[PDB]
Enzyme design. Structure first.
Site, PDB file in Angstrom:
ATOM      1  CB  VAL A  32     -90.118 -60.869  21.672  1.00 20.52           C
ATOM      2  CG1 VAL A  32     -89.472 -60.250  22.901  1.00 20.52           C
ATOM      3  CG2 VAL A  32     -89.291 -60.527  20.425  1.00 20.52           C
ATOM      4  CB  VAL A  33     -89.668 -64.536  26.078  1.00 17.34           C
ATOM      5  CG1 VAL A  33     -89.900 -64.677  27.596  1.00 17.34           C
ATOM      6  CG2 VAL A  33     -90.160 -65.776  25.359  1.00 17.34           C
TER       7      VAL A  33
ATOM      8  CG  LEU B 144     -85.856 -69.617  36.142  1.00 14.44           C
ATOM      9  CD1 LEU B 144     -87.313 -69.537  35.797  1.00 14.44           C
ATOM     10  CD2 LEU B 144     -85.341 -71.040  35.844  1.00 14.44           C
TER      11      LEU B 144
ATOM     12  CG  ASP C  16     -89.810 -77.529  19.087  1.00 11.37           C
ATOM     13  OD1 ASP C  16     -89.658 -78.366  18.165  1.00 11.37           O
ATOM     14  OD2 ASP C  16     -90.863 -76.876  19.214  1.00 11.37           O
TER      15      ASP C  16
ATOM     16  CE  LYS D 217     -84.593 -73.798  19.132  1.00 11.50           C
ATOM     17  NZ  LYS D 217     -86.050 -74.125  19.145  1.00 11.50           N
TER      18      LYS D 217
END
Ligand SMILES: O=S(=O)(O)c1cccc2cccc(Nc3ccccc3)c12
Ligand SMILES: O=S(=O)(O)c1cccc2cccc(Nc3ccccc3)c12
Ligand SMILES: COc1ccc2c(c1)/C(=C/c1cnc[nH]1)C(=O)N2
EC number: 2.7.11.22
Length: 302
Positions: A21-22, A87, A131, A133
């Protein structure tokens, strides 16, 4: 002035990346919102491997408008917290919110152009994302899009097994990686971006596989099973099997209906099987598809 994790207030989870998680958080001191990436360190066998740190050093040196900015690093016991600029949204959320009408073409063009600028810069600085995506492409209120959550060639901290890393990553993985190629090139990022370009246009993931072999078959079913004529050396790649089904190539006119010849031309060069014929980020910027590229601001809602 060193920051401490007690100086940050959790606001809400905003993403699921390679390391879990971020979080969106608020610096209790300045009131500034930020994004937090937590990395669990496993100081066992010998400690932290220099190799991993080397890759990270190159990433640390990157400085470009289309690469998310690292604001600070916080060390604790066996943990590492990276404080990043926050952001508005990521590309996945934006597409999901625009799925009923789709992202306007000028925005698609602007984002692809910017991502290509970001990648061209990375590739000329010995850095590959690996990576790519939609989830790790960040967009701000001012129309900019930025690269984030770079993959390392070498494992760094303790792995985090999530659907995003174990499965979603596969959807955008280049065929040479799926076929066990010895050493791949910056071209693998162009493949990923090509898949994302298609997705922004059709509003649906191009190759959503659930395993490496399923991913490979989905790719062959659409672009056709590659052969020595189309991709010299393909039949000798580590994981290539003569027993692979042989599908014929489908026309992009069907794969990505909305695109005109310039868009299909660019897309085809980004999704070329042979990494040697795949267009470079730098060359792609000069593609006629970007003749009328602008810098529009998105219609963000939440
Ligand atoms: O070099 S630092 O300035 O810390 C650093 C700065 C920015 C990003 C980093 C990412 C991973 C590890 C680091 N260093 C690290 C090295 C050994 C143990 C824990 C963290 C990073
Ligand atoms: O977090 S990222 O968004 O990739 C990132 C974004 C911007 C600057 C970065 C500098 C060093 C390491 C990163 N990432 C990293 C990659 C693997 C392990 C630990 C840190 C940086
Ligand atoms: C995965 O790595 C990162 C690094 C820096 C970041 C975000 C994600 C990030 C994600 C995000 C998701 N929805 C809004 N912001 C952000 O704002 N800054």
């Amino acid at each position: 002035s060193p920051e401490f994790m007690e100086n940050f207030q959790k606001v809400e989870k905003i993403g699921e990346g390679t390391y879990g998680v971020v979080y969106k958080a608020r610096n209790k001191l300045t009131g500034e919102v930020v994004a937090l990436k937590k990395i669990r360190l496993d100081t066992e066998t010998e400690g932290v491997p220099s190799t991993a740190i080397r890759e990270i050093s190159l990433l640390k040196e990157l400085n470009h408008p289309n690469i998310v900015k690292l604001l600070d690093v916080i060390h604790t016991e066996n943990k590492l917290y990276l404080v990043f600029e926050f952001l508005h949204q990521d590309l996945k959320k934006f597409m999901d919110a625009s799925a009923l009408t789709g992202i306007p073409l000028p925005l698609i063009k602007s984002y692809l152009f910017q991502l290509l600028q970001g990648l061209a810069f990375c590739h000329s600085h010995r850095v590959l994302h690996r990576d790519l995506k939609p989830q790790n492409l960040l967009i701000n209120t001012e129309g900019a899009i930025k690269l984030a959550d770079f993959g390392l060639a070498r494992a760094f901290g303790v792995p985090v097994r999530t659907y995003t890393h174990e499965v979603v990553t596969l959807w955008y993985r280049a065929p040479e990686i799926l076929l066990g190629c010895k050493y791949y090139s910056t071209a693998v990022d162009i493949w990923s971006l090509g898949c994302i370009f298609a997705e922004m246009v059709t509003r649906r993931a191009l190759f959503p596989g659930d395993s490496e072999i399923d991913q490979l078959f989905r790719i062959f079913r659409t672009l056709g099973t590659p052969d020595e004529v189309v991709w010299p050396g393909v039949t000798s790649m580590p994981d290539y099997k003569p027993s692979f089904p042989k599908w014929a190539r489908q026309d992009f006119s069907k794969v990505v209906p909305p695109l005109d010849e310039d868009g299909r031309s660019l897309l085809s060069q980004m999704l070329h099987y042979d990494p040697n014929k795949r267009i470079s980020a730098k060359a792609a910027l000069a593609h006629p598809f970007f003749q009328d590229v602008t810098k529009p601001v998105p219609h963000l809602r939440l």
